[PDB]
Symmetry: C3
Subunit: 252 residues, 3 copies
């Protein structure tokens, strides 16, 4: 039985970490499984969005310290912890139950959107063990929540309850306990209903603009805009809207 489970529902790829006895800690198998799933997402024209979740009601306790201690290839060159150093092109939603800690919070941060149960919690407690959250936690958390709160969490290693995380803008959708995945599917379906080229281009511009200067951002953006505006889907979108009916996207 695979330690990462994958199920396709229409155009949504549901990815489930399947090590509940190990609190879904990331070992070599999970790291590879996550990378393979992201490859599948981006490579399959029939997929639009992925959801990442942890089986059994707990998202991810972080990297498997035992697996790490004994030489498992957990942090993979070019990919990081599963995909922390190589986020997918298509949208990724993290559906969080229970604890998303350390590497677990870093997986969530590598996703684009977070749906979290009201009783879930985040955190990067690495400094408590004289270590540092090097899987993107320090690079992404201050960009997702207010800088000083990210600093506080990083220096103290305190847990961040989901409801506070929603107040701070880290969590998009608060769900009833046990229903985060269903809430995430609803979110995914809203995104898969939109133009696939436009959705991917939109994510691309938001992510890449972080590295653009104010003086160049519009010209850099234009290069991404043109293939969308001349696509078949751009025509179909205009036709469908004018005819008040659902657009039939082709991703071309």
């Amino acid at each position: 039985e695979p330690e990462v489970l994958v199920e396709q529902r229409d155009r949504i790829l549901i990815i489930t970490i399947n090590r509940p006895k190990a609190k879904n800690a990331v070992n070599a198998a999970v790291s590879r499984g996550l990378a393979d799933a992201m490859d599948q997402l981006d490579g399959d024209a029939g997929l639009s969005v992925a959801i990442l979740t942890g089986g059994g009601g707990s998202f991810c306790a972080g990297m498997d310290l035992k697996a790490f201690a004994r030489g498992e290839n957990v942090v993979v060159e070019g990919r990081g912890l599963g995909f922390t150093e190589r986020p997918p092109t298509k949208p990724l939603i993290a559906a969080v139950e229970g604890y998303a800690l350390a590497g677990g919070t870093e997986l969530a941060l590598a996703a684009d959107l977070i749906v979290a149960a009201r009783d879930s919690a985040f955190g990067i407690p690495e400094v408590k063990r004289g270590l540092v959250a090097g899987g993107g936690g320090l690079l992404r958390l201050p960009e997702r929540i207010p800088y000083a709160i990210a600093m506080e969490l990083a220096l103290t290693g305190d847990n961040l309850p989901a409801e506070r995380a929603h107040e701070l803008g880290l969590v998009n959708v608060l769900a009833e306990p046990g229903t985060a995945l269903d809430a995430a599917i609803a979110l995914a379906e809203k995104i898969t209903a939109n133009g696939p080229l436009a959705v991917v281009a939109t994510k691309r511009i938001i992510t890449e603009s972080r590295g653009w200067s104010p003086d160049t951002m519009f010209a850099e953006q234009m290069k991404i805009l043109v293939p969308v505006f001349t696509s078949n889907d751009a025509k179909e979108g205009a036709i469908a809207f004018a005819e008040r009916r659902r657009p039939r996207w082709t991703g071309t």
Copy 2:
């Protein structure tokens, strides 16, 4: 009757999009009218602040798709949608009633401050039509509200209610329905009461610092600081404060 109306009240320029039957959608006339108004604002020494609003109780439904479809010069080279690619030097407040959607939200984002009615709403639904919000929406929204919420709005095309937008920091002032312009005038008057050179320099530093490195930001800032500190208004400000009375600014 002009499709963009302009009224000067003391040192405040009130700019009103005047196409209520077209939901104040931006066509060629409105685009040019907005650009002319911003030129007027920045060029007139007797003006300190502008307010942009949509006549009739709805801010702006976005770009006029019909005007666009039939070849109106709506997105002007060097300026964008009115002024989206050329924001004014002096402060601009958007006073939002009803819907500010797509290009309408992009106009608001190109302003510095937003006053919005409690029953108003924002959004960038471009992906629903297989298009992308290329008028600065994707470049500015993630800088105004938490990154993940900006991502969510961009990928889903969902409306953002004004009250939520205030929670997220996009909206400065929530106003009673129908009173956004009056609230905006109150805000504008607070700013026009302050030193005009200092106000413009302050905006300049906040906007331009986005493109400065940590190692250079103070030296870059200094170049903007010096002309302010040696201005006539700097002297007048100190004198007025010491004498507990209103400063008589000259903008020199």
Copy 3:
């Protein structure tokens, strides 16, 4: 009696501006005193965290305008207002009571974390006197709170009440009036309990990553990570955790 008081409590350096009759305004003596305290913090292996506070129930009214007017060396080359242009390496918490205005807000912004009394207030009213908040206020406030609110505060010179500042993410901890320092000590103790090399490295990555590109951030981060992961404290942290007891850090 020194105009800046310094007390060591275990590994915490408590720094108190001691000019209550002058609302703890920063003159030459206070500027130098603050710089010396930060040097002490960073230079002493027995110190982990500092707390900055204003004696008597008011944080800092800003730069001493009288001292400034008559030629005191208040803004020191290479350091700024005390330390605004040279923030410490180790974590700094500002414990705010009463008013932190102008230069006072800039001192707080140069700290990493802010604990503020529920009845305290911030602000950068420089534009009211035809001046500009050049001590880092304009460079840091838009990075700590939502951009548009930072713009609003900078252009209006309005006070920012502590409770609103907490909503916006500027204030980490809201304290009962008169108890901000005790709340700050609790926060400091949480941080001093964590691995000193890991804490300093964590702060370093969060602060320096502001000037890194997305394409280089992980490689830049790695250089800071390696000395932490190979430290004696990394070993001790792992041992202590496995033995369910407190780690005895050495800062090596």
